[PDB]
Amino acid sequence: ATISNLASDIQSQVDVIDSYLKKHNLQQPSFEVDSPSELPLDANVQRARLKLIETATSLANLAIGSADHLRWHCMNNKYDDMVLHFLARYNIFDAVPRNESISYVELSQKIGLPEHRLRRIMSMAYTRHLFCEPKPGFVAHTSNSALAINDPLAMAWILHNVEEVQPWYANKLVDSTKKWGDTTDPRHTGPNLNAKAGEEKLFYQIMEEDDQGEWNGVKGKGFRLWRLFDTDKFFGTGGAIKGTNMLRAFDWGKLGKATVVDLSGITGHLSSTVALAYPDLTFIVQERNQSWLEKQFNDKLPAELKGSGRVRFMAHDKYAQQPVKDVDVFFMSTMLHKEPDEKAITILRHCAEAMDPKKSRIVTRDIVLDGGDPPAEDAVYQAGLGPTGVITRLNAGIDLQMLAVLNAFERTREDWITLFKTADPRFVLKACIQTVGDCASVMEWVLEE
Amino acid sequence: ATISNLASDIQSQVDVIDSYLKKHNLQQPSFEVDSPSELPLDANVQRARLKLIETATSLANLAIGSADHLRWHCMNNKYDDMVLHFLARYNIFDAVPRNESISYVELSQKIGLPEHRLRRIMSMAYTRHLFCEPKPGFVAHTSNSALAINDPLAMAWILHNVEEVQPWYANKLVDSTKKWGDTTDPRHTGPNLNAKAGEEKLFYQIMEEDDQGEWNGVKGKGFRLWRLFDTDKFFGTGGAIKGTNMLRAFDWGKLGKATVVDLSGITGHLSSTVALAYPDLTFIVQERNQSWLEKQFNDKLPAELKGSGRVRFMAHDKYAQQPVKDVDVFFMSTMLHKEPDEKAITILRHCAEAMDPKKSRIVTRDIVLDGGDPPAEDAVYQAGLGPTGVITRLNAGIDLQMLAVLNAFERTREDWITLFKTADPRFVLKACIQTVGDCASVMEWVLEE
């Protein structure tokens, strides 16, 4: 890489994107409040986007240079997260009006954060194009910050990372590695470094048991788990992993009238997206129960689905035998990646024992670390992959989140195939489709004699 | 901003830099091990560099877009720091040979980190151009990582941030703000959120007292403070704030044969740089004593200065009267920014009482948040400043480090002038010079009747 060749590559990638936007009369992205929040899903546009992010980031890295690389990174980067911590806990997104500016004096008063400290936090926020200072003394939104107005799912994602993942797990991972080595046991995690025998706490136990707090309509026991469920929904409502991508990566219409057991769990928000598009499907969403789960699940269903039975909650232990009969599809999105091989095999064997091989299939959605195949219309590394690819990087972030919190791990295509064949040697991978811009693939599995 | 106008601005900035490199037969930066570690200090080149970093980063931010902004940031960013934590604690920089590749198998064995976990850490490192995978199965250095080989100062900066600043202070700043409000008291910091009365610990008390560890030649009591002193030296040896910039921002030769009391403290590494350049100066470096400080100070002096008396340590309480007579210069680099107004005024009055107004001056070096004046040859915002400027961002990182650890703060030019005039109304700011590429200014103060 040289600064000149990176600049030339940037111009080529920009020209692909800009030409497509102009040809199709599409809005140009900006940092204004009402900028589009994404670029078109056209595969060639998304390839250019993924390459542009990588090449622009590489050029900034090269221009910073090696002398300022660690000097600046270890100074600044952790404060981007601390700034978000303040913005979420003081509800600054909602306190700044969407379409107007607000003085620091008025903003400070609205949120109860002394103005001199507010000013020092906002100064750092602006450097990530998160809010802006349109005139001296005043604060306004940007594209990036306005999209989080009135969005508890986005606030959940900030706070889960800054108040739980980073302090309890990531910042203890070196010590956990030294204490237990490289294991897949979710007890071998930061909260347990000094735990007395038999008193180890699992992440999911802390999530479901802590009662000292409230989040987004759940007060007391399990508020942190409810907030975690909100983070899962955040990844479905928009952005790279949005749930509507599944409609492009798998043909739900080919199932006709069919029963889907959705072992993705959580609140069934992906089942709801598919159900709205395909009224002949019934989704039975299976998840470990919590006192508030059935009520919250039902309250969050799209209005059109409430009371219809098309998407319904069924409390279930995913490690136990399957009670639903005549299931056409076992569906599980971003669920098996939390399961080391033996636990994943238990789940998959309970599904297989409940499958009619001639009629049933398993549809999974997970990272394939090497890459899924693009959708047929869209057919050294694919854009976004390779050592500096932005999808390589997102996959690594998710993989390290699985490591830090659970000792779980992401898998390659061959890893998935081997896992399923160990569960039942009759499993065949029929399709592994990843839309350009997304890190997950939708995989279709059948039992063949 | 649009993607096209950012791309055009990138091409203009690259052309300035590339034309200068070619005209002067200078090496092109790359990610290779032996890339230059910085660009020329020519002011127009550095202005173009600072603008290029900002514009490239803005273009990557825009191409990511608002939908993936928080989704990706809160996933990935904290892992850049966790990766550094591993790289430093397992000494991966030194274990990868500078000029050769090493297999993951051999690297894992050298450092005692299981290979599967090593591979998952390196995957994330590569996305910041920190090491690379030149062939499948093998690891090599990049420009960015090779510069940290055999550099305990760089390792100190990683570990101080990831093991002390972030967990003990930054990740508790919201809670500290809620407990105490906006104060300048260094007791009102994260370690003391639950401290019992009169048992509060100051950062600098923890640094100097903890004896459960070792760092870079200091075993036991005060190892963390020694590591902090190494971080201070790291900012002097290279990069934006390198100490040789002071030779451009102030004329030490005009002093002739002169005595300088250096209240920067630490290990006098900036005094050593000036002393090597100006043999007629004597520097008396004043700092709070520690058992190991005089020995380490003397061992780290440049060979040419050892035993010469040109740079010597004098234990001193900066809040106490000044014992040295006939001082020509009181020098203090990045020291007063840790001092709230009343404490800074105490120091400055002790200096002023020891000054002959006709002969003496104070030379300070600190951030001026609005910007110092460029050196005379180099004469809405200056490059690097403004809301997304990279020097604005570094200043904010340092300002938030001062907030989180000490409740201290950075200052504008007018803040500095007001502070000095409160200390003694005879103080006049004669010069405030900031070299392009650096965040600190060198300020010259005299007493005028």
Q: With helix as H, strand as E and coil as C, how does chain B read? A: CCHHHHHHHHHHHHHHHHHHHHHCCCCCCCCCCCCCCCCCCCHHHHHHHHHHHHHHHHHHHHHHCCHHHHHHHHHHHHHHHHHHHHHHHCCHHHHCCCCCCEEHHHHHHHHCCCHHHHHHHHHHHHCCCCCECCCCCEEECCHHHHCCCCCHHHHHHHHHHHHHHHHHHHHHHHHHHHHHCCCCCCCCCHHHCCCCCCCCCCHHHHHHHCCCCEECCEECCCHHHHHHHHHHHHHHHCCCCCHHHHHHHCCHHHHCCEEEEECCCCCCHHHHHHHHHCCCEEEEEEECCCCCHHHHHHHHCCHHHCCCCCEEEEECCCCCCCCCCCCCEEEEECCHHHCCHHHHHHHHHHHHHCCCCCCCEEEEEEEECCCCECCHHHCCCCCCCCCCCHHHHHHHHHHHHHHHHHCCCCECHHHHHHHHHHHCCCEEEEEEECCCCCCEEEEEEEECC
Domain B67-147: which CATH class? mainly alpha
Judge contact between B176 and B188, C-beta under 8 A: yes
B67: nearest CB among A37, A56, A85: A37
B157: nearest CB among A57, A74, A404: A74
Instruction: Name every residue whose Cβ is closer than 8 Å to that of residue A300 and which is 6 or more positions away in sequence.
Output: A267, A269
Judge contact between A352 and A424, C-beta under 8 A: yes
Judge contact between B413 and B370, C-beta under 8 A: yes
Tokens of B402: 């001062």
Whether the CA torsion A91, A97, A101, A106 is positive or negative: it is: negative
A52: nearest CB among B63, B117, B235: B63
CB-based contact (8 Å) between B70 and chain A? Answer: yes
Judge contact between B332 and B261, C-beta under 8 A: no
State the Cα–Cα distance between residues A259 and A284, nearest whole angstrom: 8
Instruction: Name every residue whose Cβ is closer than 8 Å to that of residue A227 and which is 6 or more positions away in sequence.
Output: A156, A159, A160, A215, A216
Please name the method used to determine this structure. Answer: X-ray
Q: Are strands A427-433 and A440-447 parallel, antiparallel or unpaired?
A: antiparallel
Judge contact between B45 and B18, C-beta under 8 A: no
Inspect the interface and report whether the beta carbons of B37 and A75 lie closer than 8 Å: no
CB-based contact (8 Å) between A408 and chain B? Answer: no
User: Which of B247, B427, B165, B445 has its CA nearest to residue B331?
Assistant: B445
State the Cα–Cα distance between residues B70 and A149, nearest whole angstrom: 12
Shortest Cα–Cα distance, A435 to chain B (Å): 16
State the Cα–Cα distance between residues A58 and B253, nearest whole angstrom: 41
State the Cα–Cα distance between residues B410 and A120, nearest whole angstrom: 10
Shortest Cα–Cα distance, A422 to chain B (Å): 21
User: Which of B123, B404, B141, B78 has its CA nearest to residue A173?
Assistant: B78
Following CA atoms B272, B276, B277, B281 in sequence, which dihedral angle do they give, to the nearest 10 degrees?
70
**Residues of chain A neighbouring B88 (CB-CB closer than 8 A):** none
Instruction: Name every residue whose Cβ is closer than 8 Å to that of residue A81 and which is 6 or more positions away in sequence.
Output: A161, A162, A166, B74, B77, B78
Angle subtended at Cα A400 by Cα A399 and Cα A401, rounded to the nearest 5 degrees? 90
Disruptive mutation site among A4, A35, A62 for chain B (greatest number of B CBs within 10 Å): A62
> Residue B235, class by beta-carbon neighbours within 10 Å (0-12 exposed, 13-18 middle, 19+ buried)?
buried
Shortest Cα–Cα distance, A48 to chain B (Å): 10
User: Which of A255, A246, A249 has its CA nearest to residue A274?
Assistant: A246
State the Cα–Cα distance between residues B446 and B449, nearest whole angstrom: 10
User: Which of A313, A335, A386 has its CA nearest to residue A204?
Assistant: A335
User: Which of A225, A194, A188, A167 has its CA nearest to residue A406?
Assistant: A188
CB-based contact (8 Å) between A56 and chain B? Answer: yes
A67: nearest CB among B38, B58, B71: B38
Disruptive mutation site among B34, B51, B53, B64 for chain A (greatest number of A CBs within 10 Å): B64
Shortest Cα–Cα distance, B260 to chain A (Å): 29
User: Which of B333, B408, B399, B412 has its CA nearest to residue B372?
Assistant: B412
Inspect the interface and report whether the beta carbons of A82 and B171 lie closer than 8 Å: yes
State the Cα–Cα distance between residues B394 and B440, nearest whole angstrom: 10
CB-based contact (8 Å) between A158 and chain B? Answer: yes
Judge contact between B436 and B374, C-beta under 8 A: yes
Instruction: Name every residue whose Cβ is closer than 8 Å to that of residue A82 and which is 6 or more positions away in sequence.
Output: A162, B170, B171, B173, B400, B404
Phi first, then psi, for residue A199 (nearest 5°) are -115, 20
Tokens of B355: 């000054």
| Residue A62 to residues A74, A394, B147, B188, Cα–Cα distance (Å) | 17, 21, 14, 39
State the Cα–Cα distance between residues B277 and A262, nearest whole angstrom: 73
User: Tokens 């479901």 appear where?
Assistant: A208
> Which residues sit opposite B333 in a β-bridge?
B365
Judge contact between B76 and A46, C-beta under 8 A: no
State the Cα–Cα distance between residues B295 and B106, nearest whole angstrom: 39
Inspect the interface and report whether the beta carbons of A120 and B38 lie closer than 8 Å: no
**Residues of chain A neighbouring B116 (CB-CB closer than 8 A):** 182
Partner A, chain B 220-279, Cβ-Cβ below 8 Å: 234-235, 238-241
Phi first, then psi, for residue B257 (nearest 5°) are -80, 120
State the Cα–Cα distance between residues B288 and B286, nearest whole angstrom: 7
H runs (alpha helix) in A96-184: 104-111, 115-126, 143-146, 152-160, 173-180
State the Cα–Cα distance between residues B439 and B393, nearest whole angstrom: 10
Overall resolution, Å: 1.3
Q: Are strands B361-367 and B440-447 parallel, antiparallel or unpaired?
A: antiparallel
> Which residues sit opposite B287 in a β-bridge?
B315
